[PDB]
Design an enzyme around this catalytic site. Structure first.
Site, PDB file in Angstrom:
ATOM      1  N   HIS A  61       0.819  -1.208   0.000  1.00 60.21           N
ATOM      2  CA  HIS A  61       0.000   0.000   0.000  1.00 60.21           C
ATOM      3  C   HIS A  61       0.853   1.259   0.000  1.00 60.21           C
ATOM      4  O   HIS A  61       0.412   2.318  -0.445  1.00 60.21           O
ATOM      5  CB  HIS A  61      -0.919   0.009   1.222  1.00 60.21           C
ATOM      6  CG  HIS A  61      -1.911  -1.109   1.237  1.00 60.21           C
ATOM      7  ND1 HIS A  61      -2.833  -1.294   0.228  1.00 60.21           N
ATOM      8  CD2 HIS A  61      -2.133  -2.096   2.138  1.00 60.21           C
ATOM      9  CE1 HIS A  61      -3.581  -2.347   0.508  1.00 60.21           C
ATOM     10  NE2 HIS A  61      -3.177  -2.852   1.660  1.00 60.21           N
ATOM     11  N   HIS A  93       2.214   8.857   0.486  1.00 62.19           N
ATOM     12  CA  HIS A  93       1.111   8.676  -0.465  1.00 62.19           C
ATOM     13  C   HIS A  93       1.551   9.547  -1.635  1.00 62.19           C
ATOM     14  O   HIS A  93       2.012  10.672  -1.426  1.00 62.19           O
ATOM     15  CB  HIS A  93      -0.192   9.217   0.108  1.00 62.19           C
ATOM     16  CG  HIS A  93      -0.640   8.514   1.353  1.00 62.19           C
ATOM     17  ND1 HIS A  93      -1.368   7.342   1.363  1.00 62.19           N
ATOM     18  CD2 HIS A  93      -0.427   8.826   2.656  1.00 62.19           C
ATOM     19  CE1 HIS A  93      -1.568   6.994   2.646  1.00 62.19           C
ATOM     20  NE2 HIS A  93      -1.014   7.866   3.468  1.00 62.19           N
ATOM     21  N   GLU A 103      -2.950  13.524   0.106  1.00 61.84           N
ATOM     22  CA  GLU A 103      -4.275  13.162   0.589  1.00 61.84           C
ATOM     23  C   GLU A 103      -4.974  14.454   0.986  1.00 61.84           C
ATOM     24  O   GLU A 103      -6.070  14.765   0.499  1.00 61.84           O
ATOM     25  CB  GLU A 103      -4.154  12.189   1.762  1.00 61.84           C
ATOM     26  CG  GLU A 103      -3.414  10.927   1.355  1.00 61.84           C
ATOM     27  CD  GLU A 103      -3.845   9.709   2.138  1.00 61.84           C
ATOM     28  OE1 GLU A 103      -3.740   9.742   3.372  1.00 61.84           O
ATOM     29  OE2 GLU A 103      -4.295   8.725   1.517  1.00 61.84           O
ATOM     30  N   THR A 196      -6.498   7.229   7.192  1.00 60.26           N
ATOM     31  CA  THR A 196      -6.933   7.421   5.808  1.00 60.26           C
ATOM     32  C   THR A 196      -6.958   6.103   5.028  1.00 60.26           C
ATOM     33  O   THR A 196      -7.193   6.102   3.822  1.00 60.26           O
ATOM     34  CB  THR A 196      -6.038   8.424   5.053  1.00 60.26           C
ATOM     35  OG1 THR A 196      -4.728   7.874   4.897  1.00 60.26           O
ATOM     36  CG2 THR A 196      -5.962   9.744   5.809  1.00 60.26           C
ATOM     37  N   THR A 197      -6.672   4.995   5.709  1.00 60.42           N
ATOM     38  CA  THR A 197      -6.764   3.671   5.096  1.00 60.42           C
ATOM     39  C   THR A 197      -7.607   2.838   6.046  1.00 60.42           C
ATOM     40  O   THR A 197      -7.770   3.192   7.212  1.00 60.42           O
ATOM     41  CB  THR A 197      -5.408   2.920   4.967  1.00 60.42           C
ATOM     42  OG1 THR A 197      -4.946   2.529   6.273  1.00 60.42           O
ATOM     43  CG2 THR A 197      -4.368   3.777   4.266  1.00 60.42           C
TER      44      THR A 197
HETATM   45  N1  LIG Z   1      -2.546   7.080   6.382  1.00 63.64           N
HETATM   46  S1  LIG Z   1      -2.536   7.252   7.976  1.00 63.64           S
HETATM   47  O1  LIG Z   1      -3.851   7.660   8.375  1.00 63.64           O
HETATM   48  O2  LIG Z   1      -1.427   8.094   8.315  1.00 63.64           O
HETATM   49  C1  LIG Z   1      -2.237   5.676   8.722  1.00 63.64           C
HETATM   50  C2  LIG Z   1      -1.635   5.620   9.968  1.00 63.64           C
HETATM   51  C3  LIG Z   1      -1.373   4.391  10.543  1.00 63.64           C
HETATM   52  C4  LIG Z   1      -1.699   3.210   9.886  1.00 63.64           C
HETATM   53  C5  LIG Z   1      -1.250   1.895  10.448  1.00 63.64           C
HETATM   54  O3  LIG Z   1      -0.152   1.815  10.970  1.00 63.64           O
HETATM   55  N2  LIG Z   1      -2.052   0.823  10.330  1.00 63.64           N
HETATM   56  C6  LIG Z   1      -3.499   0.959  10.176  1.00 63.64           C
HETATM   57  C7  LIG Z   1      -4.040  -0.246   9.436  1.00 63.64           C
HETATM   58  N3  LIG Z   1      -3.730  -1.494  10.146  1.00 63.64           N
HETATM   59  C8  LIG Z   1      -4.197  -2.658   9.378  1.00 63.64           C
HETATM   60  C9  LIG Z   1      -5.685  -2.891   9.483  1.00 63.64           C
HETATM   61  C10 LIG Z   1      -6.495  -2.803   8.360  1.00 63.64           C
HETATM   62  C11 LIG Z   1      -7.847  -3.092   8.429  1.00 63.64           C
HETATM   63  C12 LIG Z   1      -8.368  -3.467   9.636  1.00 63.64           C
HETATM   64  F1  LIG Z   1      -9.693  -3.757   9.710  1.00 63.64           F
HETATM   65  C13 LIG Z   1      -7.611  -3.565  10.771  1.00 63.64           C
HETATM   66  C14 LIG Z   1      -6.261  -3.272  10.686  1.00 63.64           C
HETATM   67  C15 LIG Z   1      -2.284  -1.590  10.369  1.00 63.64           C
HETATM   68  C16 LIG Z   1      -1.764  -0.382  11.107  1.00 63.64           C
HETATM   69  C17 LIG Z   1      -2.314   3.285   8.641  1.00 63.64           C
HETATM   70  C18 LIG Z   1      -2.585   4.512   8.055  1.00 63.64           C
HETATM   71 ZN   LIG Z   2      -0.941   7.856   5.471  1.00 63.69          ZN
END
Ligand SMILES: NS(=O)(=O)c1ccc(C(=O)N2CCN(Cc3ccc(F)cc3)CC2)cc1
Ligand SMILES: [Zn+2]
Length: 259
Positions: A61, A93, A103, A196-197
């Protein structure tokens, strides 16, 4: 189950994670003139050690650099934060052209890339995962990237991308100081938002820096050389791995400066 392709992209995430339509989703379009100057906010301090980085990984990703978060050596404090949040990782991103990739957007303008320094409230929660679910669990500092002059410190990172070009690969990445990717200004916009994911949890206090950093087109191209795909698969370049602006829903964007 989710990605940035035509079939599993951001416009479809809500079909799997309904909170995607929530009241504090990120990113957003920052209307600078509507941001509220908040002089009551404390100075934003990014106190980062030089050797806390562990590795660099292509997780399919984005490309992510993870950190040792055992203590409060590398933390963000001040601004809208009530206490220190420990840096867990940073990632980016980006798009396929200079007109897209970030974003967050400012007055409708996008930057070619956006860096996210992800921190968590380790003083309150036991795990990053535990924190990632609570409203005050995370603090993400966003830094816009523009293309222009080459960025000296970025070279160490862009040179490492070749070894993690395929999804699911990682490499050792020691003594990289994330402070080297910060602009000379600590002015910012802040608002309550979300990851944001997926899972898109509304657990993030967003701190978007006003000043972007610049890297060369050559360096930006190194990010576009990464792949969403694994080695023995039809190559698909990792680009446009960003979520577009979401409804503000009456939230207040605060600014540490006057426009
Ligand atoms: N871009 S952002 O908002 O800055 C961001 C910040 C942290 C993260 C991050 O480390 N993961 C979030 C997602 N998860 C996996 C996940 C996916 C789906 C689920 F239902 C549960 C966990 C791993 C940890 C992702 C995005
Ligand atoms: Zn991010």
């Amino acid at each position: 189950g989710w990605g940035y392709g035509q079939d599993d992209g951001p416009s479809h995430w809500h079909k799997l994670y309904p909170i995607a339509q929530g009241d504090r989703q990120s990113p957003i379009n920052i209307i600078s003139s509507q941001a509220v100057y908040s002089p009551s906010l404390q100075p934003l301090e990014l106190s980062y050690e030089a050797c806390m980085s562990l590795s660099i990984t292509n997780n399919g990703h984005s490309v992510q650099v993870d950190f040792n978060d055992s203590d409060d050596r590398t933390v963000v404090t001040g601004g809208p934060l009530e206490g220190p949040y420990r840096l867990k990782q940073f990632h980016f991103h980006w798009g396929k052209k200079h007109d897209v990739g970030s974003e967050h957007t400012v007055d409708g303008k996008s930057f070619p890339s956006e860096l996210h320094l992800v921190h968590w409230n380790a003083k309150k929660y036991s795990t990053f995962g535990e924190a990632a679910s609570a409203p005050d669990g995370l603090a993400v500092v966003g830094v816009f990237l523009e293309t222009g002059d080459e960025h000296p410190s970025m070279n160490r990172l862009t040179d490492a991308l070749y070894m993690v070009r395929f999804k699911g690969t990682k490499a050792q990445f020691s003594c990289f100081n994330p402070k080297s990717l910060l602009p000379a200004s600590r002015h910012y916009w802040t608002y309550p938002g979300s990851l944001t994911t997926p899972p898109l949890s509304e657990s993030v206090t967003w701190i978007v820096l006003r000043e972007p950093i610049s890297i060369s087109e050559r360096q930006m191209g190194k990010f576009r050389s990464l792949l969403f795909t694994s080695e023995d698969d039809e190559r698909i370049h990792m680009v446009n791995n960003f979520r577009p602006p979401q409804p503000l829903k009456g939230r207040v964007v605060k600014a540490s400066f006057r426009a």
